[PDB]
Amino acid sequence: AGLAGQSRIDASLKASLLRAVVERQRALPLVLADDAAIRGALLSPDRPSLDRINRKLEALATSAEAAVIYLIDRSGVAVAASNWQEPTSFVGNDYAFRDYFRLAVRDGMAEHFAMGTVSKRPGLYISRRVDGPGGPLGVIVAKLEFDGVEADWQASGKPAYVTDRRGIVLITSLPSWRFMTTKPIAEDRLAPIRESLQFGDAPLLPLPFRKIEARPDGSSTLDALLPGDSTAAFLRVETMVPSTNWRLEQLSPL
Amino acid sequence: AGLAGQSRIDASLKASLLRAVVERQRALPLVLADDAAIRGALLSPDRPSLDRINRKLEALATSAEAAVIYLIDRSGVAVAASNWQEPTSFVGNDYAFRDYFRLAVRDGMAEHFAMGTVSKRPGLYISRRVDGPGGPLGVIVAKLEFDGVEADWQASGKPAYVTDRRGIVLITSLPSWRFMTTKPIAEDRLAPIRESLQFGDAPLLPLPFRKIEARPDGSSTLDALLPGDSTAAFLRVETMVPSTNWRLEQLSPL
Ligand SMILES: [Mg+2]
Numbered sequence: 172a173g174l175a176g177q178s179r180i181d182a183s184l185k186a187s188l189l190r191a192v193v194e195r196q197r198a199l200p201l202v203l204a205d206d207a208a209i210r211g212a213l214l215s216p217d218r219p220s221l222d223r224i225n226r227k228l229e230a231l232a233t234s235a236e237a238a239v240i241y242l243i244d245r246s247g248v249a250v251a252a253s254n255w256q257e258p259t260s261f262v263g264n265d266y267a268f269r270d271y272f273r274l275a276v277r278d279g280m281a282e283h284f285a286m287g288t289v290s291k292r293p294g295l296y297i298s299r300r301v302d303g304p305g306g307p308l309g310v311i312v313a314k315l316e317f318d319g320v321e322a323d324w325q326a327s328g329k330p331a332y333v334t335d336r337r338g339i340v341l342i343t344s345l346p347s348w349r350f351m352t353t354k355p356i357a358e359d360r361l362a363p364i365r366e367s368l369q370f371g372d373a374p375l376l377p378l379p380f381r382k383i384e385a386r387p388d389g390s391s392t393l394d395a396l397l398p399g400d401s402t403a404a405f406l407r408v409e410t411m412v413p414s415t416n417w418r419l420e421q422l423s424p425l
Numbered sequence: 426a427g428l429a430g431q432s433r434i435d436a437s438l439k440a441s442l443l444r445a446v447v448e449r450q451r452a453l454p455l456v457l458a459d460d461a462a463i464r465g466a467l468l469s470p471d472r473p474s475l476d477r478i479n480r481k482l483e484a485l486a487t488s489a490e491a492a493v494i495y496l497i498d499r500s501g502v503a504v505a506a507s508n509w510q511e512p513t514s515f516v517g518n519d520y521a522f523r524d525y526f527r528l529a530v531r532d533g534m535a536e537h538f539a540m541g542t543v544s545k546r547p548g549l550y551i552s553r554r555v556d557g558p559g560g561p562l563g564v565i566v567a568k569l570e571f572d573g574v575e576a577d578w579q580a581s582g583k584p585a586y587v588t589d590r591r592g593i594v595l596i597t598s599l600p601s602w603r604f605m606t607t608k609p610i611a612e613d614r615l616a617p618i619r620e621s622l623q624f625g626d627a628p629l630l631p632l633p634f635r636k637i638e639a640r641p642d643g644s645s646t647l648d649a650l651l652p653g654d655s656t657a658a659f660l661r662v663e664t665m666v667p668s669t670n671w672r673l674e675q676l677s678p679l
């Protein structure tokens with residue numbers, strides 16, 4: 172009973188710190204979209220211009236929590252990236268199938284989680300349409316990765332994971348829960364999610380928690396496997412991540 | 426003996442994480458100095474232009490580890506700031522006495538620690554000269570505060586503090602050690618440090634550690650007061666903070 176109360180406090184602090192990371196990085200694509208140098212490189216994508224944007228994005232990404240910042244042209248090809256010197260450079264790749272590109276193109280802005288296609292690293296993509304005097308020029312994207320957050324959750328001793336409204340695990344202190352599911356997921360909805368490549372080739376399997384037992388207060392007990400450990404019992408609480416479509420669930424070792 | 430070894434590892438990890446925070450934020454004033462909009466606002470410091478820089482710096486500071494980013498004109502007055510909406514806005518204040526302004530003006534770049542005059546908040550100021558076609562226009566400054574780092578040190582259970590080459594405490598997991606001294610400090614060198622306003626009005630008193638006893642391996646034992654605690658004995662180790670002029674010292678409770 173007192174464990175449930177403390178666990179709520181700890182879950183609420185995790186979700187609070189997580190919202191603030193996201194909300195901090197929403198500002199970055201918004202300021203870069205109105206940037207004359209960005210607009211200019213899309214108007215005239217010459218070598219000198221793209222090299223200047225490459226250097227600028229690299230320095231901007233160094234200073235910010237976002238792992239990667241990149242510039243996509245109107246055709247959906249990335250022309251500049253902060254990781255331009257890396258073997259995993261996003262430059263030259265076609266993005267155009269990603270909702271973060273096509274919803275930004277259509278609506279002015281977009282945001283979603285994905286397993287990256289070049290990096291093979293999961294993240295949140297926050298994107299903004301770049302507009303010119305005569306209309307849409309491209310899309311600027313910030314990719315936020317949550318490795319540091321996950322490591323902190325892990326070191327707390329109360330594992331946690333974050334799901335969308337379909338119940339798919341996006342962010343997790345235990346890597347092997349990633350893109351597994353809290354909810355059942357009907358065969359006709361699974362195929363479209365899989366084919367979209369949002370979560371790469373993840374089979375989207377239910378999370379392997381056993382003897383899940385719902386309690387009056389909203390919590391559940393369950394049996395779970397953590398690395399190096401035999402099966403152990405946990406209390407699970409959940410809370411909203413405000414300013415997102417996400418839910419945080421946290422396990423407390425009994 | 427085994428405590429000293431673990432303590433070295435923990436001190437080395439603190440100093441390593443600290444260097445990386447600093448080195449990440451060095452990139453930010455460097456990229457903003459070559460920014461046409463920044464250069465443009467200094468060439469023509471009109472209301473529309475300064476308002477655009479205010480908004481841009483605000484969004485950039487939100488996304489980055491730096492607390493405040495601000496733009497100083499050639500006369501040393503701050504014309505734009507990320508905190509422009511705050512009661513502690515740096516806009517309108519004269520900086521021109523700070524080494525971070527006048528060394529940037531003279532050398533192109535500067536960096537130092539100070540107790541802020543408007544904020545009353547301590548930080549590292551990393552600055553870069555803004556150059557025009559016909560010469561120096563101003564100075565862009567990023568202010569990095571270390572509250573998050575200090576809180577992490579505190580939560581580790583091994584208190585730590587960071588000194589310059591004069592032995593003045595800049596960064597500390599215990600606030601009351603700030604701007605105290607590890608070394609003695611001759612009366613003729615104290616006056617110039619105090620009068621410079623680098624550390625506000627701090628009396629620059631020696632740290633209050635008692636029964637300091639040097640050990641063969643480089644460590645010392647000492648008696649110290651932590652909040653809520655009576656006097657306790659500590660092992661102290663120190664290590665370089667690479668890429669800085671700083672030394673990290675860490676206490677381990679015996
Ligand atoms: Mg980054």
Ligand SMILES: [Mg+2]
Binds near residue numbers: 486490491
């Ligand atoms: Mg900041």
